[PDB]
Amino acid sequence: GSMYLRITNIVESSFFTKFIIYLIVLNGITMGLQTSKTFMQSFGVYTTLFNQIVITIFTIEIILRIYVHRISFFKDPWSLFDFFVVAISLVPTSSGFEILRVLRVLRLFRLVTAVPQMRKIVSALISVIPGMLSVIALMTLFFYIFAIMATQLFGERFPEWFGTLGESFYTLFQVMTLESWSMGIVRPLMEVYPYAWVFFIPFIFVVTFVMINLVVAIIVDAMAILNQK
Amino acid sequence: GSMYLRITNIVESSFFTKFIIYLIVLNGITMGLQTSKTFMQSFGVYTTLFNQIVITIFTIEIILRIYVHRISFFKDPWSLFDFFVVAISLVPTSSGFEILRVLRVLRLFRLVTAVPQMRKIVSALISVIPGMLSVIALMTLFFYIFAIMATQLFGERFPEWFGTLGESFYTLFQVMTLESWSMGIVRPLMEVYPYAWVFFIPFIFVVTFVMINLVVAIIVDAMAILNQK
Amino acid sequence: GSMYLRITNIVESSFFTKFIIYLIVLNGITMGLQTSKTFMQSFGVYTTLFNQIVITIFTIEIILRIYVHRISFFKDPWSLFDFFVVAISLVPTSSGFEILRVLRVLRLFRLVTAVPQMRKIVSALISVIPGMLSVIALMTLFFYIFAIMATQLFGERFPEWFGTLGESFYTLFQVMTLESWSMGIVRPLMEVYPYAWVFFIPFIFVVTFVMINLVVAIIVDAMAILNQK
Amino acid sequence: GSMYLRITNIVESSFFTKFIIYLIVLNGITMGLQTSKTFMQSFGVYTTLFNQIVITIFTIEIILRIYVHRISFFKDPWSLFDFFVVAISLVPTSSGFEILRVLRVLRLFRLVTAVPQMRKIVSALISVIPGMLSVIALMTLFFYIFAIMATQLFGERFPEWFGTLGESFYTLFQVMTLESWSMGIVRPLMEVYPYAWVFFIPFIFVVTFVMINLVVAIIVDAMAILNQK
Ligand SMILES: CCCCCCCCCCCCO[C@@H]1O[C@H](CO)[C@@H](O[C@H]2O[C@H](CO)[C@@H](O)[C@H](O)[C@H]2O)[C@H](O)[C@H]1O
Ligand SMILES: CCCCCCCCCCCCO[C@@H]1O[C@H](CO)[C@@H](O[C@H]2O[C@H](CO)[C@@H](O)[C@H](O)[C@H]2O)[C@H](O)[C@H]1O
Ligand SMILES: CCCCCCCCCCCCO[C@@H]1O[C@H](CO)[C@@H](O[C@H]2O[C@H](CO)[C@@H](O)[C@H](O)[C@H]2O)[C@H](O)[C@H]1O
Ligand SMILES: CCCCCCCCCCCCO[C@@H]1O[C@H](CO)[C@@H](O[C@H]2O[C@H](CO)[C@@H](O)[C@H](O)[C@H]2O)[C@H](O)[C@H]1O
Numbered sequence: 081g082s083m084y085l086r087i088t089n090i091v092e093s094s095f096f097t098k099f100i101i102y103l104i105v106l107n108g109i110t111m112g113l114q115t116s117k118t119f120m121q122s123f124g125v126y127t128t129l130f131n132q133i134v135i136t137i138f139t140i141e142i143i144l145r146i147y148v149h150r151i152s153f154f155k156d157p158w159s160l161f162d163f164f165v166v167a168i169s170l171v172p173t174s175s176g177f178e179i180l181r182v183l184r185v186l187r188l189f190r191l192v193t194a195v196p197q198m199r200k201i202v203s204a205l206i207s208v209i210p211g212m213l214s215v216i217a218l219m220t221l222f223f224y225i226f227a228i229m230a231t232q233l234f235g236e237r238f239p240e241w242f243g244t245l246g247e248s249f250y251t252l253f254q255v256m257t258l259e260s261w262s263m264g265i266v267r268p269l270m271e272v273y274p275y276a277w278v279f280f281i282p283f284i285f286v287v288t289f290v291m292i293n294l295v296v297a298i299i300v301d302a303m304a305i306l307n308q309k
Numbered sequence: 310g311s312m313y314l315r316i317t318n319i320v321e322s323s324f325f326t327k328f329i330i331y332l333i334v335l336n337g338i339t340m341g342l343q344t345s346k347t348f349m350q351s352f353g354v355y356t357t358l359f360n361q362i363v364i365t366i367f368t369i370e371i372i373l374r375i376y377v378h379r380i381s382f383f384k385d386p387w388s389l390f391d392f393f394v395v396a397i398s399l400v401p402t403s404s405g406f407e408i409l410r411v412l413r414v415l416r417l418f419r420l421v422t423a424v425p426q427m428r429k430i431v432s433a434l435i436s437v438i439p440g441m442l443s444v445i446a447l448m449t450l451f452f453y454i455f456a457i458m459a460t461q462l463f464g465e466r467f468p469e470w471f472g473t474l475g476e477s478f479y480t481l482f483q484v485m486t487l488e489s490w491s492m493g494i495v496r497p498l499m500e501v502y503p504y505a506w507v508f509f510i511p512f513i514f515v516v517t518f519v520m521i522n523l524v525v526a527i528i529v530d531a532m533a534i535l536n537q538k
Numbered sequence: 539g540s541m542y543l544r545i546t547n548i549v550e551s552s553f554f555t556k557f558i559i560y561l562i563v564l565n566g567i568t569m570g571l572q573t574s575k576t577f578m579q580s581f582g583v584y585t586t587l588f589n590q591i592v593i594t595i596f597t598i599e600i601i602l603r604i605y606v607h608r609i610s611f612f613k614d615p616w617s618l619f620d621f622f623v624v625a626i627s628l629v630p631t632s633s634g635f636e637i638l639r640v641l642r643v644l645r646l647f648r649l650v651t652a653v654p655q656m657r658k659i660v661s662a663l664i665s666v667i668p669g670m671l672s673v674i675a676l677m678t679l680f681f682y683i684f685a686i687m688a689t690q691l692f693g694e695r696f697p698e699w700f701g702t703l704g705e706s707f708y709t710l711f712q713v714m715t716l717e718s719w720s721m722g723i724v725r726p727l728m729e730v731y732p733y734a735w736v737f738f739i740p741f742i743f744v745v746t747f748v749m750i751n752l753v754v755a756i757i758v759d760a761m762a763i764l765n766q767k
Numbered sequence: 768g769s770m771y772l773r774i775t776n777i778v779e780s781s782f783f784t785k786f787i788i789y790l791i792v793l794n795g796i797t798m799g800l801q802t803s804k805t806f807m808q809s810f811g812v813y814t815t816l817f818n819q820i821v822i823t824i825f826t827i828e829i830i831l832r833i834y835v836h837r838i839s840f841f842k843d844p845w846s847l848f849d850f851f852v853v854a855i856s857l858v859p860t861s862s863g864f865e866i867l868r869v870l871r872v873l874r875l876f877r878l879v880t881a882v883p884q885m886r887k888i889v890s891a892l893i894s895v896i897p898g899m900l901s902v903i904a905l906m907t908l909f910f911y912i913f914a915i916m917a918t919q920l921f922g923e924r925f926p927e928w929f930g931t932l933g934e935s936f937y938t939l940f941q942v943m944t945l946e947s948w949s950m951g952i953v954r955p956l957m958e959v960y961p962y963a964w965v966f967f968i969p970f971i972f973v974v975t976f977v978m979i980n981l982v983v984a985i986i987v988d989a990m991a992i993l994n995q996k
């Protein structure tokens with residue numbers, strides 16, 4: 081129909097999508113003043129009020145551009161995100177956790193969707209991830225096998241650090257980033273277990289070698305693309 | 310006029326600008342001995358005295374080379390800097406803060422202006438910054454959205470770290486550099502909030518992925534320029 | 539013989555090796571639930587039972603594919619690994635240390651052997667190591683010479699950090715990763731030994747210069763290979 | 768003369784220089800067992816005895832190869848080093864400091880001189896340094912100007928960290944490596960000086976931008992050489 085075209089040249093319009101970018105920037109400043117108990121005690125009304133207006137508008141416009149583009153709307157990753165942070169946001173307060181009240185702030189990520197220069201650079205960042213998969217595979221297997229070892233070795237005398245398989249995972253991740261791996265983790269262990277450095281000096285070495293190579297992978301792959309294009 | 314040319318071939322002279330480089334190096338050694346309470350108690354007079362002589366000379370010469378080059382002086386970034394650290398310096402003591410007394414030391418950055426090899430390498434460093442803008446954009450939006458979350462989640466029971474939106478920003482920046490993110494920030498939070506690692510392990514991951522890519526961006530862009538030039 | 543070919547087209551089969559990949563994934567989930575004292579108190583029987591079944595199967599199949607390929611089996615690094623983590627695993631409990639009971643978990647690294655995409659990426663990582671050898675040589679010599687110095691200088695008044703040649707090695711390695719090198723190591727030393735920063739500021743500088751170059755070595759070597767291939 | 772050629776084909780011989788490599792490796796193992804108070808109490812005699820034999824041999828051979836090559840010996844950086852760690856070593860004990868007794872261990876760096884594969888990789892590492900000079904220049908000027916500021920701002924209430932111009936330099940260097948810059952340096956300062964992060968968040972930013980670029984400089988320069996050669 082032609083009323084269809086009337087609605088498409090509204091919704092595909094520059095001004096329509098530019099308007100909801102201003103609605104994004106407005107609701108980001110509001111989002112930020114909500115973290116002020118002073119502001120909320122004066123303008124807590126006008127503010128949360130403004131937060132409900134922007135959410136109906138995004139649902140009015142997610143129903144509108146779900147109509148303009150019908151099923152094609154759903155094979156698009158960026159539209160799915162706008163649908164799934166509008167709806168994560170669409171849940172009302174005092175229902176569920178507060179964790180949903182805070183995840184409503186995820187709707188600021190609609191700025192990355194509605195802005196072109198931003199969906200470009202995010203396309204770059206995710207374009208990189210297919211290549212990293214084999215090393216992130218190898219990498220995980222390593223953290224798994226070494227978390228099992230570390231729990232079996234240390235989980236009984238250092239339970240806050242190696243009790244769970246998970247507690248072990250976390251500490252190891254922490255050690256990988258060299259966050260206090262020595263004065264804080266390994267040195268305290270050599271007070272009970274003297275040859276513990278045999279477990280962590282190998283460990284530090286291997287995940288640092290693999291991080292270097294993961295990054296050289298990003299660097300050469302990109303260079304190869306540039307060279308071939 | 311020809312008295313104009315007399316003043317231009319003075320001010321565009323090698324010796325003129327080389328002389329104010331020695332005045333820079335002299336006033337840097339003086340600048341440094343001023344931080345010695347011993348030195349200041351003997352030669353505090355001769356010293357601050359020397360600091361007032363170099364500042365009139367730079368204003369004599371900023372009035373001179375503002376005359377030689379008239380308006381063109383102002384469309385030049387390096388001359389604006391010399392004008393704005395001479396004048397930040399031109400404010401007298403006991404007026405305002407001490408923060409202006411110390412910012413007078415910024416006039417040592419005139420060494421980067423008056424030396425060619427130095428304005429070259431600074432040109433390299435700033436030439437890099439136009440490219441970084443889209444990722445620094447994305448990056449900020451992320452720190453904002455996640456500071457709001459983190460205040461809403463933790464600002465009441467950990468007020469020194471998540472009370473303000475700003476307190477949150479700082480801690481997050483701190484966590485990004487892996488400065489005691491674990492034994493110091495996240496582990497203390499898991500004493501009250503057990504599933505806090507769900508907020509920071511994602512967070513550490515995303516800003517490390519984006520830092521890697523920002524740096525691979527610098528590396529490939531530069532490589533591309535070299536290849537095409 | 540043709541019974542030989544009957545056994546080879548069994549053992550070189552897709553399904554045979556795919557089956558022992560499922561046996562790997564099964565014995566990894568089991569491996570992981572063993573670290574649960576709750577799980578072990580109910581299903582400790584069924585579980586360790588399952589661990590003995592998978593080890594006979596791997597020895598049945600290491601005797602099988604040592605037959606199919608006879609001596610060639612042994613000039614292959616990945617088969618040697620499967621032979622040496624099956625046999626490290628083949629030792630029975632209550633004989634030796636517990637350190638062998640835990641190293642049995644190394645048999646999960648059979649997933650990297652039995653999966654193609656995984657032996658590829660490990661081939662990449664080890665392919666990189668021949669080049670790094672001269673800098674790892676230089677590097678070690680440096681840690682040695684500087685551990686000897688550091689013990690001679692500090693081992694008597696700081697025995698937990700510089701008593702052994704080994705204690706010195708460890709601390710230095712720790713300092714190299716910038717793990718609390720300052721508030722934790724060097725600042726406490728400047729309470730007794732004031733000009734200690736002369737030993738560690740040079741040291742931090744040299745191993746950071748050499749790490750940068752080691753990584754630029756990986757990056758240019760790989761780039762050169764890409765360019766020439 | 769021909770006795771000259773007799774001495775040159777001795778000193779330029781493979782076996783001559785290979786022999787003093789074994790003397791290097793021997794005196795490195797000895798060097799290392801000297802840090803053992805147990806070893807020194809049994810074999811302290813045989814050991815230090817061995818240390819005096821190797822030093823006469825190196826002076827016999829530094830007088831020999833100073834004769835074979837006369838003045839050309841001195842325009843060679845690697846021979847100057849062998850002359851200046853033999854002579855730093857030639858000073859006798861109980862004269863001067865112990866700091867000279869320990870610097871005798873520097874003579875192990877003769878292994879890098881006497882081995883070809885080693886003087887190669889050190890040639891690589893130093894070949895890189897001419898390029899880094901302009902950024903290390905800019906870099907220093909920055910640490911200087913900002914150490915002066917930081918002493919003027921904080922040296923009176925935090926004297927162990929900002930009292931000297933030097934104390935300031937050290938702390939800043941420490942902050943640059945992100946070693947406890949937050950929970951340890953800047954957070955304690957915001958207890959007295961609340962807007963201190965304005966001094967260090969800019970500071971952390973600028974030296975991290977410049978480190979990234981210094982390393983991209985190494986990476987592209989090397990790539991350019993590879994491409995043009
Ligand atoms: C936009 C969507 C993004 C989806 C996120 C995808 C995540 C992909 C994982 C990549 C992140 C790796 O995670 C991060 O790796 C860095 C690598 O610098 C490691 O960090 C450590 O390793 C490096 C090696 O490079 C050490 O030299 C360094 O001292 C330290 O930073 C940590 O292990 C982890 O903090
Ligand atoms: C001359 C004028 C200069 C104007 C300044 C322009 C500033 C531009 C911003 C670039 C600086 C980024 O700021 C800095 O990023 C580094 C990236 O190494 C991060 O630092 C961290 O991230 C890296 C990833 O590379 C981790 O692997 C690593 O363990 C840690 O160093 C921090 O987040 C921050 O300290
Ligand atoms: C798959 C089999 C693998 C066999 C393992 C082979 C090991 C080869 C050794 C390479 C590992 C080097 O070991 C690791 O080097 C990193 C380099 O990032 C150093 O780590 C440090 O150096 C870097 C320089 O890049 C600093 O800028 C940084 O703040 C810090 O991470 C440490 O010294 C060590 O943790
Ligand atoms: C063989 C003779 C050698 C002569 C020595 C020549 C020295 C030349 C100076 C290069 C060394 C720079 O010194 C070192 O720089 C590293 C850069 O990784 C910095 O270290 C820091 O900066 C990086 C940026 O890359 C941060 O992202 C990172 O978290 C941290 O490691 C420190 O400021 C310092 O420890």
Ligand SMILES: [Ca+2]
Nearest residue numbers: 260489718947
């Ligand atoms: Ca730290």
